Design an enzyme around this catalytic site. Structure first.
Site, PDB file in Angstrom:
ATOM      1  N   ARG A  54       0.861  -1.180   0.000  1.00 54.43           N
ATOM      2  CA  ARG A  54       0.000   0.000   0.000  1.00 54.43           C
ATOM      3  C   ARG A  54       0.894   1.226   0.000  1.00 54.43           C
ATOM      4  NH1 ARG A  54      -2.258   3.193   4.351  1.00 54.43           N
ATOM      5  NH2 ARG A  54      -4.205   4.223   3.721  1.00 54.43           N
ATOM      6  N   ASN A 101      -1.377   0.177  12.159  1.00 54.73           N
ATOM      7  CA  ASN A 101      -2.166  -0.558  13.141  1.00 54.73           C
ATOM      8  C   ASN A 101      -3.628  -0.614  12.741  1.00 54.73           C
ATOM      9  OD1 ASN A 101      -3.554   1.726  14.273  1.00 54.73           O
ATOM     10  ND2 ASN A 101      -1.674   2.301  15.323  1.00 54.73           N
ATOM     11  N   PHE A 112       5.101   1.845   8.196  1.00 54.88           N
ATOM     12  CA  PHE A 112       5.135   2.754   7.087  1.00 54.88           C
ATOM     13  C   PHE A 112       6.312   3.705   7.201  1.00 54.88           C
ATOM     14  CE2 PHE A 112       2.990   6.491   9.105  1.00 54.88           C
ATOM     15  CZ  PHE A 112       2.411   5.885  10.210  1.00 54.88           C
ATOM     16  N   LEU A 121      -1.223  11.672  12.715  1.00 50.97           N
ATOM     17  CA  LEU A 121      -1.010  10.325  13.233  1.00 50.97           C
ATOM     18  C   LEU A 121      -0.345  10.351  14.610  1.00 50.97           C
ATOM     19  CD1 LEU A 121      -0.024   8.509   9.933  1.00 50.97           C
ATOM     20  CD2 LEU A 121      -2.301   8.761  10.972  1.00 50.97           C
ATOM     21  N   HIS A 125      -0.145   6.381  16.191  1.00 49.15           N
ATOM     22  CA  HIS A 125       0.839   5.433  15.674  1.00 49.15           C
ATOM     23  C   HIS A 125       2.145   5.631  16.378  1.00 49.15           C
ATOM     24  CE1 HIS A 125      -1.676   4.141  12.250  1.00 49.15           C
ATOM     25  NE2 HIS A 125      -2.255   5.285  12.549  1.00 49.15           N
TER      26      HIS A 125
END
Length: 164
Positions: A54, A101, A112, A121, A125
């Site tokens: 991704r 997550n 990432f 984030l 994260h």
């Protein structure tokens, strides 16, 4: 000092080069240790041969689902999932290395590498390192993404390990 690890990355079988990551074991020892061991493969499983599945231009490149190869899988060296260690390190800019997550306390092996400041984030994260070398490689990976996250080339971590 803090571990240095590497990912060697292909796109459609062509080598892009090497991404070197410093893992902040002094701040997030548990999260750093998981990633370190998944790079060396010393537990019998890890990132070698898995993909960046991704990738979203002007956002981030996501990898680490070495079980399902699609964003639903992965596992840690501790068990399937593990807690958010802390949110001390922030998503300050490109090159930040952070855990993907599925909500609070669902770290496994997916991660990432940011290509922008992903400040929203912060507190969600766990940041645990950053790119030391190979931002050019990261930018290549990024360029093979799309708005949906679908990659236009098959992006494979062909080798990985620990440098120091």
């Amino acid at each position: 000092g803090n571990p240095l690890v590497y990912l060697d990355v292909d796109a459609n079988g062509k080598p892009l080069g090497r991404v070197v990551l410093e893992l902040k074991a002094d701040v997030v020892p548990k999260t750093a240790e998981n990633f370190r061991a998944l790079c060396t493969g010393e537990k019998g499983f890890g990132y070698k041969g898995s993909t960046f599945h991704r990738v979203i231009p002007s956002f981030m490149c996501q990898a680490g689902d070495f079980t399902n190869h699609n964003g639903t899988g992965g596992k840690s060296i501790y068990g399937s999932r593990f807690p958010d260690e802390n949110f001390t390190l922030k998503h300050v800019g490109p090159g930040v290395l952070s855990m993907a997550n599925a909500g609070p306390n669902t770290n496994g092996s997916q991660f990432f590498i940011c290509t922008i400041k992903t400040d929203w984030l912060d507190g969600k994260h766990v940041v645990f390192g950053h790119v030391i070398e190979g931002m050019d490689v990261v930018k290549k990976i990024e360029s093979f993404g799309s708005k949906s996250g679908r990659t236009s080339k098959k992006i494979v971590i062909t080798d990985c390990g620990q440098l120091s």
